[PDB]
Amino acid sequence: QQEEGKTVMYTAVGSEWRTFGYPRRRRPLDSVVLQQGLADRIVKDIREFIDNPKWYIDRGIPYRRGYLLYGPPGCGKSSFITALAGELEHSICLLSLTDSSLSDDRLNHLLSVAPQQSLVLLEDVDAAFLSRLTFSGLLNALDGVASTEARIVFMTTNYIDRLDPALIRPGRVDLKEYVGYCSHWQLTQMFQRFYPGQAPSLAENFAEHVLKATSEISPAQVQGYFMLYKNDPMGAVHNIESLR
Amino acid sequence: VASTEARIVFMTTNYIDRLDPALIRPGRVDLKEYVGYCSHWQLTQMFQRFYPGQAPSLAENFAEHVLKATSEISPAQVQGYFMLYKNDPMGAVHNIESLR
Amino acid sequence: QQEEGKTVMYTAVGSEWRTFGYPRRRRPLDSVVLQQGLADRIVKDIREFIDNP
Amino acid sequence: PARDRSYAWLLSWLTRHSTRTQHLSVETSYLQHESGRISTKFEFIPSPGNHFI
């Protein structure tokens, strides 16, 4: 009980995984609020996949699963990935495929030598697919059997139209989810999270005012606005009309 | 002769016509085998392996329907189709005609 | 009985064999179904070759 | 002797065969995996002295 869990980020240089930085504090899962039940669905799917390794080995199917998260930027995708990794006590292996330093063979080698009990995150997947750089080479390398036990891979991108349905298939990305802008439930959850204990009607009015003012409000913008009025709920509520 | 004790070597290829009979000889490839598409026995074995415990008649009907629909069905395609209807044998059986 | 066997893949770089990746779980033989008796024939031939040095 | 590997095997077999051993010692398997994952398990072993089976 005196030991605090930490999340370790693994960066890739050349054809090797390196421990970038120092162990980080694990962000609580409830801190990130995406939607009504998207977090629950993703957590349940991940728990089912992890807790049933006998199912995959007996049927001779690779113990590999992939997820895709597409939505507006700043919607809390990477934060949710970090929170999920902290909950599962895994480690994220962040890799930017948008860089031209790595090639298709280099990407396959890095993805095959990923540490055990570790997650791999490949952001900006649209850039490589749109175009060292390759579009089909990455998906060919993903389907390669060169991997380890329980290779969980997460896909995140701003838009999904640039990709193709061939990417989404068994043995590849399996459960894609769309993260959207804040809703009334999301806004009131954020308001009660930032300010520990207030009138729920006040939070509801705040959420309604924000929804009326803006239609495509992002959670990053909400957090930035909250930072302006830190430890000031009434002033923030009175200043909602200022945002317009 | 540059080898060690018990040097077992396996050859795999998509087609054999590109090679020559000189390759197949003692001191070389010895027991060549041809792997083919799924059969009725193979299909029912796969069905009972993926789903632990069902009616063998259901598996036989599934195999017959697959054989009628496709003549060159590959086991990889069968596994991929099973992944679509994971933990869903009745739906998979009803969706055999969908493959055509 | 508490030890689980593993299969190790050896890759080749330059003129040397290297241990690629980590030890993998051994896929059961019955999981792969090729034909009526091809697996049995191959297994029997391999066992005969190994067991008679 | 303790140097031989049959020591641990015999002790585990003893602690299994004689479930109700009033005198016993404890062996802890502790492994802190990367990313701060701690795995612990208590293996109980017969204590030094005399035992009857």
Ligand SMILES: Nc1ncnc2c1ncn2[C@@H]1O[C@H](COP(=O)(O)OP(=O)(O)O)[C@@H](O)[C@H]1O
């Ligand atoms: N659901 C959320 N709950 C709390 N904070 C969020 C949420 N979504 C976004 N944020 C905040 O917005 C910022 C987004 O930064 P960034 O990681 O660049 O974008 P994204 O999180 O979309 O990958 C984070 O610092 C985070 O604090």
